[PDB]
Design a protein around this nucleic acid. Sequence first.
DNA 1: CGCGGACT
Length: 164
Amino acid sequence: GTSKLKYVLQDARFFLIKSNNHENVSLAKAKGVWSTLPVNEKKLNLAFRSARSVILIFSVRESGKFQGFARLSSESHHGGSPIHWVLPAGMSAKMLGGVFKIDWICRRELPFTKSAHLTNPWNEHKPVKIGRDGQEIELECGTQLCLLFPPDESIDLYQVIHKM
DNA sequence: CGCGGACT
């Protein structure tokens, strides 16, 4: 809904998530979780401590479109049940390391053509589509970007009402 | 010997 979608985005930190394949993104939302690299794992634990909400905006590499956005719900931990990610060349399973469990808010895609007017002040005012994995998006640019996705009636806002 | 590495 439009009433409380802005409530979960208030005082939040946004992070662009890149994936060299769409399979792991499909595995991401099918499992409702995600895992990233140690350098980005460090900063995402930093953001979870200081933000009312940490939004991960997913964009498959070389896809020309976003695949939705989700909310970080917990820090990363090791030793859990294994996830069979499609490892990019030169990436081991230990690189994934900690396990991030997220809550998806919108699963509908968004082409880059619809977000060309949005520039990220924290990436030299470049269009928000441009950026590596873990690139933080400024509050306003991230909030306006989340609003341009089509409404996902399959997801309700009552679940993540007060998970904080 | 497996040793790398998720922008547009």
